[PDB]
Amino acid sequence: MSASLILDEYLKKTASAVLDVADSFEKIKGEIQSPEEAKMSVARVGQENNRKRADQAADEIRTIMEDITGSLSGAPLEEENKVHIGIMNNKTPSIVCGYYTMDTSISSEPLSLTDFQNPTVIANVTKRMESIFSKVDSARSTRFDAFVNGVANNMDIKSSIDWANMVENVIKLPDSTPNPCSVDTIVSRDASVVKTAVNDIYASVGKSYCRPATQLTFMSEIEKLRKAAVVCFEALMSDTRERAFVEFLFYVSFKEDASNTNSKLFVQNKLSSMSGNPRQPIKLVRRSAEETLFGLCFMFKVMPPEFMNCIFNFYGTCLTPLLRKYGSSFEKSWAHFEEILSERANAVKKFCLDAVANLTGPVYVLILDLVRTLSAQRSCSTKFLREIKENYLLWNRFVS
Amino acid sequence: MSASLILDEYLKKTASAVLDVADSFEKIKGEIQSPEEAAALSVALYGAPPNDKYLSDNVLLKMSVARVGQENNRKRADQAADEIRTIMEDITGSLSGAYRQYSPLEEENKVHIGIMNNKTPSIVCGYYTMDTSISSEPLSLTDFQNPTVIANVTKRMESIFSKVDSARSTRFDAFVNGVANNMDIKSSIDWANMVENVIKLPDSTPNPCSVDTIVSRDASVVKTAVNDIYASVGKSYCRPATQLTFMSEIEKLRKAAVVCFEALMSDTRERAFVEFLFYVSFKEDASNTNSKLFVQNKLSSMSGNPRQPIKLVRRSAEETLFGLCFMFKVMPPEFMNCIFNFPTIPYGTCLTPLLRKYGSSFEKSWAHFEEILSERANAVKKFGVNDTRIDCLDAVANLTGPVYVLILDLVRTLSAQRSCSTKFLREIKENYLLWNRFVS
């Protein structure tokens, strides 16, 4: 349609409108609000400056999106104080080489369920429970008996110690085994399916609204974006899920070696680890079924109640309620994304009539929402991992 | 089917009319010249891109605003309100009402010393016990600057810094000499001297004690900003049409925005001081290291019973200088300045290059707020309010960027700042945790 029909369709529609009101004004009554109907250069520079101004706000989401998804692989005091064990596709841990070491001089046996369900190793810790709380706790809540039975009857605890054994035996065997340790200090599982998702967002905010103030109108460009968001959102949330579990165990079960009580050079070489010299493998020692039971127990009554219902069990729609009380809002901001993608999708299936705006484009305001819903989560995530390790700094202080 | 309904569809249909003309303008290699044709009450006869009027003057404005080709969205007037007024207020944790908020037991582990405006520390009542038996001499500037320990710490500095390198480990004494002979450290130790006396002395002594920390001693001036930033919609002069259009309103925001941002960057400034010194100028008690009583005492704070505070003891001049010269060697070179002048209240610009190491968010997003704001300010000042009527002043105002985006840049600037602050306050924390392991 050439420039003629461009105007005729306007003149017709804008005439059909003005006639409709009169045709419907057969009625007569009393009312006061009767809104009844029947520079160009300096006003322009307000736009030229704004268009390029708003073109960069989205452009500064190109950046942050890539920047915020550096967690999933891409492209150092925080590093060496972070656990390194990592779940691999075969549900068996996968660890970087040369970061730990384990004394194999004693024939260690894998403590199975019986080591946990023994009526003694639950009775001994039973009194150990109040030995913490009974000092100040509400003495009416001293019914910590069933609490010991709580994790005891929880048939999930089997899978816990099982994986713990899987975390256990893997360090024993060297790098010459069919379960080799990764050579680079990093681990990475879903870096590919997300890397093709971030460049998807770029291409979306890039071409779709260079300056098409109103163009997002294909059932493809919609889906070519919805699939980008749901992948990047879950993948990040997936890390927060798996990273929470994989560090919860290495802390509750494993324990720094005490025979090498020399803490004068342990801090020393740990600094060289930051330098670039080869790492000194830190030595760990396991813990008997008694205190590992005293770990899982205390670690429950301190975390929010939704923890055991979510983390111990093993887009998520299950960790989000637990995650709520730490972060500000990784969900309310996410609503506005699912709403505009909905109302735009509902319309584009029928035939804008739904999202009317000529100031900036719609795809500019969705990507401006996605960046800020992911920012909350990562900001919320790093607070959880800081909270759980904190309690580990407390449970460690008591027994050792 | 009354006047409301019949006018509603008209405004809606004519809105779709204008927007489809835009849709019709669809060609590849989109230029950067777009139609600002929508400066009217209903655009007409713009093919350029390719009887007795009343005098009430109040119904003349609101009516003309009711029918505007571009003012056809009130879901956006709320996302401004429903989000910004809420998340701006919420993100400000420099005050709190008596209702729900997010703070788990982690607050207890956080150090608790407040900086009273008189530059003297204010400590929450009864959260520390101290060895009041030995009334030793409070430390003095010459106690540090003795020629004895300045050599000793270096001898210890080689120790912890031995496994980093040997060849490039040529000399660092001059640095250690520097951190002592600096002109300001005297305030630090004197400020450290102000710690002990108030800590050991009784509660109601001439040096007072508080019930809860008011460490957000800007709570008055910052609440006035939230009393202000609501000038968008919520406050008394809730002029619903044309939010953020009157130049009087806009200049209120900038002043109210900047005061809210410098406050937070002053809060992380301040708390960076009060955490660092206390960590390096004190230590736990080597006598009463009973782990048993320790944990039950902490957990007592969660219960709400009167907690029995912890025991600490002032540190040796040796380890303090060692801790000082160490923390002045791990953090970026800027640190030595941002920790010194804090008792000499300014500026604050020196913290920005430091904090921007962690996250690239705040240093660039904040710049994007003053830009759009200044640009929108220039827009209205160029259009003399007395010259043009309101029906057009809005349509050119929102042309400079909608409201729910501008006042949202501040949030994703503010929240971005706090998100990287808590990293820095934690970065220096475990930095000291790694060092405290050595002194133990």
Residue with tokens 């790093």: A382
PDB experimental method: cryo-EM
Contacts of A286 (CB under 8 A, 6+ apart): A108, A168, A253, A254, A255
Cα–Cα distance for residue pair B70/B11, rounded to 1 Å = 10
Tokens of B172: 């660092």
Instruction: Count CB-CB contacts under 10 A for residue A134.
Output: 14
* Closest CB to A46 among B67, B163, B379: B379
Q: How many helices (H) and strands (E) does chain A have?
A: 15, 5
Q: How many CB atoms lie within 10 A of CB B378?
A: 14
Joined together, the tokens standing for residue B206 give 């001439």
Cross-chain Cβ contact A47/B39 below 8 Å = no
H helix or E strand, kind and range, residue A285: strand A282-285
Contact (Cβ atoms closer than 8 angstroms) between residue B394 and residue B68: yes
Which residues, 6+ apart, have CB-to-CB distance to A96 below 8 Å?
Answer: A84, A181, A182, A183, A184, A185, A186, A187
Contact predicate A319/A310, CB 8 Å: yes
Nearest CA in chain B to A340: B75
- Looking at A319-372, which runs of residues are DSSP E strands? none
Residue of B159, B402, B427 lying closest to A77 (CB–CB): B427
What does the longest C-alpha to C-alpha distance in chain B come to? 98
- For residue A329, give both structure tokens: 């809002």
The DSSP letter of residue A312 is I
Rg of chain B in Å (alpha carbons): 30
Strands A86-87 and A93-94, by their bridges, are: antiparallel
Positions of chain breaks in chain B, given as the residue before each break (C to N > 2.5 Å): 50, 346
Beta bridge partners of A283: A101
Separation in Å, CA of A212 to nearest CA in chain B: 7
Run of H or E residues at A134: none
- Cα end-to-end span (Å), chain B: 82
- Compare CB distances from B21 to A6, A50, A386 and report the shortest one's residue: A6
Return the bridge partners of A93, or none: A87
Interface size, chain A vs chain B, as Cβ–Cβ contacts under 8 Å: 238
Q: Following DSSP, what letter does each residue of A157-224 receive, concatenated?
A: HHHHHHHHHHHHHHHHS-TTSSSPPBSSS---SSHHHHHHHHHHHHHHHHHTTSS-TT----HHHHHH
Q: What distances in angstroms separate CA B178 from CA B157, B174, B175, B182, one per listed residue? A: 14, 6, 5, 6
Judged by CB atoms closer than 8 Å, whether chains meet at A212 and B30 is answered as yes
Q: Pick the residue of B107, B162, B163 with the most A CBs within 10 A to test the interface with A by mutation.
A: B163
A379, A389, A399, best to mutate vs chain B, most B CBs in 10 Å: A379
| CB atoms inside a 10 Å sphere around CB A132 | 22
Half-sphere exposure of A161 (CA within 13 A, CB side): 25
3-state secondary structure (DSSP) of residue A84: coil
| φ, ψ of residue B108 in degrees (nearest 5) | -65, -40
HEC string for chain B: CCHHHHHHHHHHHHHHHHHHHHHHCCCCCCCCCCCCCCCCCCCCCCCCCCCCCCCCCCHHHHHHHHCCCCCCCCHHHHHHHHHHHHHHHHHCCCCCCCCCCCCCCHHHHCCCEEECCCCCEEEECCCCEECCCCCCCCCCHHHHCCHHHHHHHHHHHHHHCCCCCCCCCCCCHHHHHHHHHCCCHHHHHHHHHHHHHHHHCCCCCCCCCECCCCCCCCHHHHHHHHHHHCCCCCCCCCCCCCCCCCHHHHHHHHHHHHHHHHHHHHHHHHHHHHHHHHHHCEEECCCCCCHHHHHHHHHHHHHCCCCCCCEEEECCHHHHHHHHHHHHHHCCCCHHHHCCCCCCCCCCCCHHHHHCCCCCCHHHHHHHHHHHHHHHHHHHHHCCCCCCCHHHHHHHHHHHCCHHHHHHHHHHHHHHHHHHHHHHHHHHHHHHHHHHHHHC
Option in A17, A215, A365 nearest B10 (CB): A17
A35, B63 contact by CB (below 8 A): yes
To test the contact with chain B by mutation, choose from A1, A5, A12, A14 the residue with the greatest count of B C-beta atoms within 10 A, namely A14
In angstroms, the separation between the Cα of residue A175 and the nearest Cα of chain B is: 27
Resolution in A: 3.7
